[PDB]
Design a protein around this ligand. Structure first.
Ligand SMILES: C[n+]1cn([C@@H]2O[C@H](COP(=O)(O)OP(=O)(O)OP(=O)(O)OC[C@H]3O[C@@H](n4cnc5c(N)ncnc54)[C@H](O)[C@@H]3O)[C@@H](O)[C@H]2O)c2nc(N)[nH]c(=O)c21
Length: 191
């Protein structure tokens, strides 16, 4: 003889997530400008957070928002990111108005909804970069050598965002990040 949980319990998410903010400051290290906002693990708590913060579209150029599974820091050095990479979405200046905010929300929902099904374990989180030269959004995965998982995640993500199918996107390995003044990171896969 107990109350029906459907009438009062919050709707749980498979994982607990953490949202981070990056504030641009040249006089300090990258890590020093990165700070945690808060965490949540239910549908209700996700909306409570999203509804009171600024849309990416309104942030000052140079700042970022990052949503990662609790325990995984949004940086290359992390145990779960060092051997991984990211599927990169490169937006033009006009998309700041038309697609940035809509794309970022769909990205958030793809993560907390575990929309990559059988390859959910390879997903680490996502990052949106607000920049004057052109905004960027990316989904980070844990292992660049897991071809099956990486290509499936890329396909689903591209489909969910809904941009024209003829547009190809690439996946970059973090370890491959350019360090030689005169080169640029190449793509491991494309979908
Ligand atoms: C995600 N992330 C970014 N930075 C730092 O932030 C910078 C700007 O990275 P951004 O992702 O916010 O990208 P942004 O749009 O602001 O602009 P941008 O692409 O122009 O610059 C990064 C790129 O510059 C190039 N680069 C940096 N240093 C060198 C170098 N010595 N030689 C050749 N290319 C370089 C690379 O292609 C690199 O991917 C990086 O160059 C790096 O110091 C990080 N540092 C640590 N330690 N861990 C991280 O996880 C991290």
């Amino acid at each position: 003889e107990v109350a029906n949980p459907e009438h009062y319990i919050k709707h749980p998410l498979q994982n607990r997530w953490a949202l981070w903010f990056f504030k641009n400051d040249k006089s300090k290290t990258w890590q020093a400008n990165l700070r945690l906002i808060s965490k949540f693990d239910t549908v209700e708590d996700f909306w409570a957070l999203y509804n009171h913060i600024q849309l990416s579209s309104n942030l000052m150029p140079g700042c970022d928002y990052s949503l990662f599974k609790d325990g995984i820091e949004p940086m290359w050095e992390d145990e779960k990111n060092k051997r991984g990479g990211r599927w990169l979405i490169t937006l033009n200046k006009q998309q700041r108005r038309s697609d940035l905010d809509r794309f970022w929300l769909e990205t958030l929902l793809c993560l907390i909804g575990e929309s990559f099904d059988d390859y959910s374990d390879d997903v680490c989180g996502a990052v949106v970069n607000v920049r004057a030269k052109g905004d960027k959004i990316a989904i980070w995965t844990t292992e660049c050598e897991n071809r099956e998982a990486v290509t499936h995640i890329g396909r689903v993500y591209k489909e969910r965002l809904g941009l024209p199918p003829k547009i190809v996107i690439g996946y970059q390995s973090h370890a491959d990040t350019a360090t030689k003044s005169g080169s640029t990171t190449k793509n491991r896969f494309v979908v």
